[PDB]
Amino acid sequence: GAMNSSNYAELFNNDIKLFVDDTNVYRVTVHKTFEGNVATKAINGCIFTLNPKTGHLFLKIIHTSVWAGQKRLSQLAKWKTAEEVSALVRSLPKEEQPKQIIVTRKAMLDPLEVHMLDFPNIAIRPTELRLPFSAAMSIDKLSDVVMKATEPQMVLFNIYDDWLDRISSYTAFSRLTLLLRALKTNEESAKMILLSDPTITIKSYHLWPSFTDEQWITIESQMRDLILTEYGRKYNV
Amino acid sequence: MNTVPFTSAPIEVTIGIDQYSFNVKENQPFHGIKDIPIGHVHVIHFQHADNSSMRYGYWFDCRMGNFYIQYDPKDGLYKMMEERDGAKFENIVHNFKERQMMVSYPKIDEDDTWYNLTEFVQMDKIRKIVRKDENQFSYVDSSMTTVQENELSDPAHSLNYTVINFKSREAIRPGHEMEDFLDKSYYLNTVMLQGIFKNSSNYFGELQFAFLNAMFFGNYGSSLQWHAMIELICSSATVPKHMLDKLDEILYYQIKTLPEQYSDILLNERVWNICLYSSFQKNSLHNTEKIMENKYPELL
Ligand SMILES: CN(CC(N)=O)Cc1cccc(Cl)c1
């Protein structure tokens, strides 16, 4: 069944599972034509496929050439996502293949099920959680590799940096979802919080700054404040 | 004109013959049904007055033998049987006919309803869906489950309809996932019509038999089969024009005959709205769309 607040801790057990988010697969800018009509121009996108226990991220970059000459692109994007996820699974050794794939948007269920017919024992599940993975393109190093790509490419990251050396997967996922929710609600402010102090750097092989345990607590508090505010600045409370 | 005579009517029962029905009282001097049109399959069906649960009945073709009904007080139902002595049977029937102990199949001459509902239904194909090879007729009841239902538990008592599953390797060619899921023409035309059914007449025969079992017995798995076979055609972009025109006639007479009080349960809202208003064939079923809109506009 669906993944929800009640079965949340299943994400951190020892059954391999992947989240798939397709929000950023088909990305466009909308603009006016010389005749005053509206047109779209695609820009490179990505599939966000994440193991929440280990932090392993399989970022498949979707180059704009895949849309050339195709119709109904928003529909095609879901099937392209499912094709690439199926190809990733087939590329993994059997002992590394997931036992479940959790899609962040329910419209991915049928495309992924059909592409995974050869894997009847991999469960395809929706979720009732409103996860903020669309904000992945607010992480500078991820946005940079997507925008620079000149052809289809898979890039591997650990979205938790080295956090698992000091904290559990549950705590790491909670920190990630906090950071991303902040970036989604007020990107400018969120990035100001993360980078305000010049002396805390991002290692070359990392995505986020090298905060001490104490600095993470302050940062996390600053992100919760931002989210609550915006929720006020929004609903006026 | 053929006859299905009855040994007796020991229990009060509503008896159906095709789309007709009449009530028989307990121990009423009823001895069967005469004037049954030759050239069609027929169904004779029963609902006991004391247990409206379990409608049950028998599909038969009088060209294949002489059949009669005798009530079994042990198994508690009216059973169809074959009489191999033709002289004895013709004599019994003549005696009953002389004493006017039979009802007459009440066909109006202008009326083509039964032909239109059974146009493609063949007794030999019924006997492959309902496997009981020692009899020439076929028993069906409200509770019998289909092979497909069983896969998701007595095999000898199952409805062996052709399994249709839109999210299956049979339906989806490797490499054509999106294509085949969104346009089921290859599954319809190559897998089912060319491969399994062989021709559209056999496909329509099973579709029509499934509907009739749903309508006469409330057989839920037959209703599922009927809708699946409709949905497979409506969800195909490429269908022979003769098949689309025939489907429109088939469905029109099915919707025409359905009891209004059962449309709530026997009509799947999603399939019909998809089929009449969203599918590739949304504009190819004019007669069916017109009767559905004038008879069941609520469902839509
Ligand atoms: C008289 N036999 C029973 C028998 N086997 O002696 C039954 C029967 C057969 C054909 C027509 C009718 Cl209605 C009754």
Distance CA B249, CA B113 (A): 11
Q: Are residues A94 and A168 in the same domain?
A: no
Q: Which residues of A4-39 are buried (b: 16+ CB within 10 A; e: fewer)?
A: eeeeeeebeeeebbbbbbbbbbbbeeeeeeeeeeee
Distance CA A223, CA A181 (A): 9
Domain termination site, one of A133, A163, A193: A163
Q: Are residues A93 and A149 in the same domain?
A: yes
Q: Are residues A97 and A146 in the same domain?
A: yes
| CA nearest neighbour of A226 among A191, A189, A194 | A189
Distance CA B286, CA B95 (A): 50
Residues A227, A185 contacting (CB under 8 angstroms): yes
Q: Are A113 and B167 inside 8 Å of each other by CB? A: yes
**A144 within a domain of the structure (yes/no):** yes
Determine the distance in angstroms separating the CA of B18 from the nearest CA of chain A, rounded to an integer: 41
Residues B5, B101 contacting (CB under 8 angstroms): no
Residues B106, B32 contacting (CB under 8 angstroms): no
Determine the distance in angstroms separating the CA of B270 from the nearest CA of chain A, rounded to an integer: 17
Q: Which CATH superfamily is domain B116-299 in?
A: Aar2, C-terminal domain-like (1.25.40.550)
Instruction: Fill in the DSSP letter of residue A176.
Output: H
Q: Are residues A143 and A178 in the same domain?
A: no
CA-nearest residue, atom 12 of ligand 1: B7
Q: Are residues A179 and A153 in the same domain?
A: no
Distance CA A218, CA B219 (A): 65
Distance CA A178, CA A227 (A): 9
**A72 within a domain of the structure (yes/no):** yes
Distance CA A64, CA B61 (A): 64
Inter-chain contacts counted by CB atoms under 8 A, chains A and B: 23
Centre of ligand 1 from the C-alpha of residue B73, in Å: 16
Which helix (H) or strand (E) segment is A132 a member of? none
Residue written as token pair 């346009």: B183
Residues B32, B102 contacting (CB under 8 angstroms): yes
Q: Are residues A25 and A117 in the same domain?
A: yes
Q: Are residues A72 and A132 in the same domain?
A: yes
Other CB atoms within a 10 A radius of the CB of residue A69 amount to 5
| CA nearest neighbour of A44 among A133, A155, A149 | A149
Mutate to test the interface with A, among B177, B183, B184, B278 (most CBs of A within 10 A): B177
B182 CB-near residues (< 8 Å, 6+ apart): none
Which helix (H) or strand (E) segment is A232 a member of? helix A213-235
Domain termination site, one of A163, A189, A218: A163
**A4 within a domain of the structure (yes/no):** no
**A114 within a domain of the structure (yes/no):** yes
Q: Are B172 and A76 inside 8 Å of each other by CB? A: no
Q: Ligand 1 pocket test: pick from B33, B70, B82, B90 the residue with the most ligand atoms within 8 Å of its Cβ.
A: B70
Resolved by: X-ray
Q: Are residues A119 and A210 in the same domain?
A: no
Q: Can you say whether residue B100 is alpha, beta or left, with left for phi > 0 and alpha for psi between -120 and 50 degrees? A: left
Sort strands A17-21 and A45-50 into parallel, antiparallel or unpaired: antiparallel
In this structure, which amino acid lies at residue B220?
Y
Domain termination site, one of A163, A182, A200: A163
Q: Which two structure tokens, joined as six digits, stand for A224?
A: 């919760």
Query: Is residue B89 in contact with ligand 1, taking CB distance under 6 Å?
Result: yes
Centre of ligand 1 from the C-alpha of residue A219, in Å: 92
B144 CB-near residues (< 8 Å, 6+ apart): B157, B158, B159, B219, B221
Secondary structure tally for chain A: helices H, strands E: 6, 8
What is the total count of domains within chain A?
2
Other CB atoms within a 10 A radius of the CB of residue A50 amount to 26
| CA nearest neighbour of A84 among A31, A18, A149 | A18
Q: Which residues of B230-247 are buried (b: 16+ CB within 10 A; e: fewer)?
A: bbbbbbbeebeeebbebb
Determine the distance in angstroms separating the CA of A143 from the nearest CA of chain B, rounded to an integer: 29
Q: Are residues A24 and A133 in the same domain?
A: yes
**A151 within a domain of the structure (yes/no):** yes
Between helix B220-234 and helix B200-217 the angle, nearest 10°, is 140
3-state secondary structure of B189: helix
Q: Are residues A113 and A38 in the same domain?
A: yes
Q: Which two structure tokens, joined as six digits, stand for B197?
A: 């059914």
Q: Are B172 and A118 inside 8 Å of each other by CB? A: no
Q: Give residue B246's Cα distance to chain centre.
A: 17
**A140 within a domain of the structure (yes/no):** yes
Query: Is residue B7 in contact with ligand 1, taking CB distance under 6 Å?
Result: yes
Q: Are residues A130 and A227 in the same domain?
A: no
Q: Are residues A49 and A159 in the same domain?
A: yes
3-state secondary structure of B82: strand
Resolution in A: 1.4
| Ligand 1 atom showing the smallest separation from residue B66 Cα | 10
Domain that includes residue A92, residue range: 9-163
